[PDB]
């Protein structure tokens, strides 16, 4: 790859600069370069990797939704035929999204997950694996849709099992995993009751453990608990 000649530490430095400049494509390319050096990632480095790709794929998802809406409207009764261009451009954006997801899943499989022994690293990588299968599922319409959904579920489930065994209920990684797995249930698996149950149980168990935390840890945990509450409000 194009980052093969750049020092690991330089790639990390540039990823931070890219973040400050809101150059998330660049940020993601620098972090991909850093992962491909083959060394495990620190906590900070894992955050940089996730932030970069979240931002890139987030922009793609937002664009895909805009295009999909236009396309769905075009296929309604009385809509004038405008040719193949809307489908073609939605397909272009979709293909680019799928590519970014495949890239991230490829980094996780080669070889971030298998070298991740600590609970925080393993849960975080498995959460990411669930997230990027979930983004694949959002655009899936073919023979493999069920398998893509199940791959998301499986990664989230392994992450959940480790998190419950090894992390306190207020751990931000545990919380963020639960938040996203709950959204998976609601939006992807057509299981809104499971989504609500998971969000509520996660919130309540975290509430009960806040007493153990420093002020700074309290702030971090409560921020994510509020997101769980926000979703519960949306859903009930």
């Amino acid at each position: 790859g194009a980052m093969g000649s750049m020092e690991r530490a330089s790639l990390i430095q540039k990823a931070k600069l890219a973040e400050q400049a809101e150059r998330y494509e660049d940020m993601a390319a620098f972090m991909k370069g850093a992962v491909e050096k083959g060394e495990e990632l620190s906590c900070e480095e894992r955050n940089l990797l996730s932030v970069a790709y979240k931002n890139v794929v987030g922009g793609q998802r937002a664009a895909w939704r805009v295009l999909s809406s236009i396309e769905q409207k075009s296929n309604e009764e009385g809509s004038e035929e405008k040719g193949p261009e809307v489908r073609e451009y939605r397909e272009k954006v979709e293909t680019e999204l799928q590519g970014v997801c495949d890239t991230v899943l490829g980094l996780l499989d080669s070889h971030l997950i298998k070298e991740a022994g600590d609970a925080e690293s393993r849960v975080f990588y498995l959460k990411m694996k669930g997230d990027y299968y979930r983004y694949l599922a959002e655009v899936a319409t073919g023979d493999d849709k069920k398998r893509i959904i199940d791959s998301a579920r499986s990664a989230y489930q392994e992450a959940m099992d480790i998190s419950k065994k090894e992390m306190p209920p207020t751990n931000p990684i545990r919380l963020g995993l639960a938040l996203n797995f709950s959204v998976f249930h609601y939006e992807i698996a057509n299981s809104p009751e499971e989504a609500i149950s998971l969000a509520k149980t996660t919130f309540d168990e975290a509430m009960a453990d806040l007493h153990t935390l420093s002020e700074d840890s309290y702030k971090d945990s409560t921020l994510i608990m509020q997101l769980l509450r926000d979703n519960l409000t949306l859903w009930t």
């Binding site: 963020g176 938040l179 939006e187 997101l227 926000d230």
Partner: peptide, 5 residues
């Protein structure tokens, strides 16, 4: 859309 992190 719902919140994810």
């Amino acid at each position: 859309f719902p919140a994810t992190v």
